[PDB]
Design a protein around this ligand. Structure first.
Ligand SMILES: Nc1ncnc2c1ncn2[C@@H]1O[C@H](COP(=O)(O)OP(=O)(O)OP(=O)(O)O)[C@@H](O)[C@H]1O
Lengths: 528, 105, 124, 170, 50
């Protein structure tokens, strides 16, 4: 095996390198990989960013930058960047060059042209984040790239992280074709956040269906520029295998910052906010690879959940203003609500999902049609009413009861989200207080009062099997077989709670018992 | 030489006259380093021995014996009906206790 | 590492370290960023920050001060520093003008260890 | 004899689903079957009703999803996801021969309640279920009702009176 | 009716100052880029010296 050289390094500026070529006859293509011989033993990979008239190669460095010196030789591979690919990558995190990282065959390209319109399909299947908010008012379907906005520490990462843990109970059950996999992509986040994510997904046995790509802050800029690309390539092969796949980016704004650092160090022409021109193309090269493919192309799907960090609830920034114009909707989080116990801290007014109903199932459309026609009036009433005035009307009651159900640490099963929201929108949850709504929900879902207190005028419908959602998803609750059983189970559980528990609660007008209860409520908020 | 002229043949150019320029390398005690028509080939003990050194490193690194070897997969319990018949409700507690013991004990 | 002890690291302050390279970047030939910062900000900051992290051998309890010029949190220098931290204590001119100290705004700050599992539930 | 079928965009579509069905019936495990719908789709030969029925057949006859076992395995949900994939996603509707495999698996697993659900659904769409399976369903039902197995044990357990987080097992 | 007039006047001042700020950042960047290139301007200088 003989390698081919082109020249040596002229100079470097941190992550950047310029090349002096030898044997001027020889050429190099545009976006190829270059291998630098820091020593006879160690070798550093790099990419060619631009070329010049004099004969020189602007290069971005990806590994072992500190070892680089002037006068070193260069070699060319003759191909684009590519990474190892396949099903042998789900359980392990990697570097965007494929180098597996420790923790306590096939290749694939980073830059593939996204599928054209004929190679695609309108979205019709859902992607369950596990949260009731998302699956009701702003649903995410497969092939429906949807943004996640928000300032620091509002619940951006936790959303996608629950979106992925939610897809572990199911992917075990359903076939290995409709099992939505997942790929996290961390860009510039601290390395210990990566290991904490690793231990989290390894705790829930989710890493069997979920890999991570990590280009941490210590990693160079050009390696942050390529991470969502390589994660998209990993999802692209699964799209070509017919599978479904999820894809997360945490986050793109640091990907843009890295691209800025590289263009400005390469003497490229800057523009607004010091970014170059093609940053909107930098993202459109990536996100449009997310799609729902056609049955002619395996029916695969690649869902993208790009995270972007706002600053003081601004959205007129260049990156956010561009990514919003690209995505098929967005999710807008507010720290004013993340502090007010509304966790996730969504902002339903500014949050949008252009795929409104066609992604959702048969069981969800009838529910979301009510929830839109409930919150639409809740906001007008809560906005016009005072802060202290009492209003006895079913909208201001039921909606505020719904906002409590929206608060939840971690995901929640489908069956539990529908029975909990069907109880409210039909008015069964009008007598209970605003505070014990989640305890009511906890009793409804995991416990079973009518099975305990002898009320068993219910042939099949109970909240202990958990295989019943697969009938709900098919028939839907509006079908004549589940409607009456559902209503009887809810009315009975409501009367039992209002009689036995909700009376005992108000009686505990003590010192220690109030705290003993409030810990129970704020714990039920978490386990659910 | 037999690889020099042959690599000059493999090069895009072969009609050009060949010229040699030799040097003394303090790093190499075995093998040779050659460059023909911007096609380098390294046959050197520094890199050659380091190749097998990397393989002999990754081989030892690949297998770690400190961690417990993975246990054989457990099949579904498939408890018999007679067990449910003899103890209607205790059986569930027994199954939970066995699972907890398998986690802790 | 070698002694295995626990360590404190009080730094006053990171922003001067940032602007130290900013005063030079224009002279090196590096084109500056939006507000007039180097383009190498997040990389140099991470290559400094990532060294600060707990390990198997020991632990570094770092504490870092920052200068927010004009009390503008949108300044990219503090902004890039969010990700490299676990407890983003924020102070404000407003709370001090009311004669209160420590001039903390509890809403505009938050920690990472604020969980029920890491600490007491009552504290949460 | 074969009615023409067209793609979304009006393109012609193959229907010779035969050899893929014979390639499915040989599936020792019911996950290579789902992997064969891919090979059908990529050849522009999408799955027919009988095709998904053969998938449900091997889902019933096969023992496990893969060679090694898997936690969270369930034949019933894997069949119902096929039904949702058939009805709403694509458009093909099932038939009595499709629901028959579902009711048979509910009988084998013994989940009598879902059995009465699938019964009340088959009778809503206008389908004649086999009484031979209804009899085994009610047999398992009464068998469980007599032995107190009508429900689990942890639901009938005494409610904790106190509002303690550890009392409720949260 | 008065608050709305004050609001639109503030929305104009905000949205105008945001534009002047963006333009100013461009002027600063291009000034640094033009100064570097103008000072670093390289020429052949094929003239007699002896
Ligand atoms: N519903 C919830 N209930 C309780 N805590 C929550 C909830 N959702 C999120 N959190 C908490 O939010 C914290 C995570 O913050 P998050 O990941 O949103 O920050 P971030 O946006 O990633 O920050 P940065 O933008 O700097 O990366 C954790 O402490 C997590 O427990």
């Amino acid at each position: 095996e003989a390698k081919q050289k082109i020249g040596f390094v002229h100079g470097i500026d941190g992550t950047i390198a310029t090349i002096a070529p030898a044997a001027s006859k020889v050429t190099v293509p545009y976006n190829t990989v270059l291998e630098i011989a820091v020593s006879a033993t160690n070798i550093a990979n790099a990419l060619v960013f631009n070329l010049e008239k004099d004969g020189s190669i602007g290069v971005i460095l990806l590994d072992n930058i500190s070892e680089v010196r002037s006068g070193q030789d260069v070699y060319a591979t003759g191909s684009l960047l590519k990474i190892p690919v396949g099903f042998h990558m789900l359980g392990k995190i990697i570097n965007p060059l494929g180098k597996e990282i420790p923790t306590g065959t096939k290749l694939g390209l980073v830059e593939e042209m996204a599928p054209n319109i004929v190679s695609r399909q309108p979205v019709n299947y859902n992607l369950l984040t596990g949260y009731k908010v998302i699956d009701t008012l702003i649903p995410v379907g497969r092939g429906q790239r949807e943004l996640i906005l928000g300032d620091r520490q509002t619940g951006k990462t936790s959303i996608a992280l629950s979106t992925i843990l939610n897809q572990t109970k199911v992917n075990n059950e359903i076939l290995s074709k409709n099992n939505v996999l997942s790929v996290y992509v961390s860009i510039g986040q601290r390395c210990s956040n990566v290991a904490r994510i690793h231990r989290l997904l390894t705790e829930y046995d989710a890493m069997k269906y979920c890999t991570i790509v990590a280009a941490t802050a210590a990693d160079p800029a050009g390696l942050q520029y390529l991470a969502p690309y390589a994660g998209t390539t990993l999802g692209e092969e699964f799209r070509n295998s017919g599978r479904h796949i999820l894809l997360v980016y945490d986050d793109l704004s640091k990907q843009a910052v890295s691209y800025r650092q590289i263009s400005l160090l390469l003497r490229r022409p800057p523009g607004r906010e010091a970014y170059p021109g093609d940053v909107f193309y930098l993202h459109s090269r990536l996100l449009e690879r997310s799609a729902m493919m056609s049955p002619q192309k395996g029916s695969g799907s690649l869902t993208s959940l790009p995270i972007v960090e706002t600053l003081s609830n601004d959205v007129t920034a260049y990156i956010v203003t561009n990514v919003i114009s690209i995505t098929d909707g967005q999710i807008y989080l507010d720290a004013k609500l993340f502090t007010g116990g509304q966790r996730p801290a969504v902002n339903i007014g500014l949050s949008v999902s252009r795929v409104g109903s066609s992604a959702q199932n048969k069981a969800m459309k009838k529910v979301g049609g009510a929830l839109k026609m409930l919150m639409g009036e809740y906001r007008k009433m809560a906005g016009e009413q005072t802060s202290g005035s009492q209003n006895v009307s079913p909208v201001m009651i039921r909606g505020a009861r719904c906002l409590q159900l929206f608060n939840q640490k971690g995901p929640s099963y489908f069956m539990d989200a529908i029975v909990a929201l069907y109880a409210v929108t039909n008015g069964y949850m009008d007598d209970v207080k605003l505070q014990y709504s989640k305890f009511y929900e906890f009793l409804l879902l995991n416990k079973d009062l009518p099975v305990l207190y002898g009320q068993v005028n219910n042939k099949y419908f109970y909240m202990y099997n958990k295989n019943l959602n697969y009938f709900i998803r098919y028939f839907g609750l509006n079908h004549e077989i589940l409607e009456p059983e559902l209503k009887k189970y809810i009315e009975i559980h409501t009367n039992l709670f209002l009689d036995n528990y909700q009376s005992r609660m108000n009686e505990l007008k003590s010192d220690e018992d109030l705290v003993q209860l409030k810990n129970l409520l704020y714990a039920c908020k978490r386990t659910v | 030489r037999k690889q020099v002229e042959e690599l000059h043949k493999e090069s895009p150019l072969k009609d050009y006259k060949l010229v040699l320029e030799t040097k003394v390398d303090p790093s190499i005690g075995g093998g040779y380093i050659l460059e023909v028509c911007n096609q380098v080939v390294n046959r050197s003990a520094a890199a050659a021995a380091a190749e097998t050194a990397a393989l002999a490193k990754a081989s030892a690194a690949q297998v770690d014996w400190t961690s417990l070897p993975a246990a054989p997969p457990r099949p579904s319990p498939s408890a018999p009906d007679t067990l449910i018949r003899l103890l209607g409700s205790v059986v569930d507690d027994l199954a939970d206790a066995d699972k907890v013991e398998q986690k802790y004990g | 590492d070698e002694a295995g002890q626990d360590v404190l690291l009080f730094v006053d302050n990171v922003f001067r370290f940032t602007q130290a390279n900013s005063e030079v970047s224009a002279l090196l030939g590096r084109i500056p960023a939006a507000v007039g910062y180097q383009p190498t900000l997040a990389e140099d900051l991470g290559m400094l920050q990532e060294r600060i992290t707990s390990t198997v051998k020991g632990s570094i309890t770092s504490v870092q001060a920052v200068y927010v010029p004009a009390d503008d949190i949108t300044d990219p220098a503090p902004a890039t520093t969010f990700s490299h931290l676990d407890a983003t204590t924020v102070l404000s001119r407003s709370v001090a003008e009311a004669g209160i100290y420590p001039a903390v705004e509890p809403l505009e700050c938050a920690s990472r260890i604020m969980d029920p599992d890491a600490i007491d539930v009552n504290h949460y | 004899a074969g009615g023409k079928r067209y793609d979304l965009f009006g393109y012609e579509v193959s229907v010779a689903t035969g050899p893929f069905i014979e390639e499915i019936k040989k599936a020792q495990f019911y996950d290579d079957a789902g992997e064969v719908i891919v090979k059908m789709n990529l050849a522009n030969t999408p799955p027919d009703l009988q095709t998904y029925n053969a998938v449900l057949e091997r889902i019933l006859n096969c023992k496990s999803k893969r060679s090694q076992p898997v936690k969270g395995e369930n034949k019933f949900a894997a069949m119902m996801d096929i039904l949702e994939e058939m009805d709403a996603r694509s458009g093909i509707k099932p038939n009595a021969e499709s629901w028959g495999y579902v009711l048979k698996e509910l009988v084998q697993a013994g989940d009598f309640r879902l059995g009465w659900v699938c019964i009340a659904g088959m009778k809503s769409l206008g389908i004649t279920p086999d009484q031979a399976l209804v009899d085994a369903n009610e047999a398992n039902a009464a068998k469980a009702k007599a032995a107190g197995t009508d429900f689990p044990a942890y639901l009938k357990k005494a409610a904790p009176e106190s509002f303690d987080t550890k009392a409720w097992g949260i | 009716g008065n608050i709305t007039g004050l609001m639109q006047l503030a929305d104009y001042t905000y949205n105008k100052t945001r534009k002047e700020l963006i333009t100013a950042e461009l002027l600063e960047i291009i000034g640094t880029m033009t100064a570097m290139h103008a000072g670093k301007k390289v020429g052949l200088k094929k003239t007699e010296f002896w």
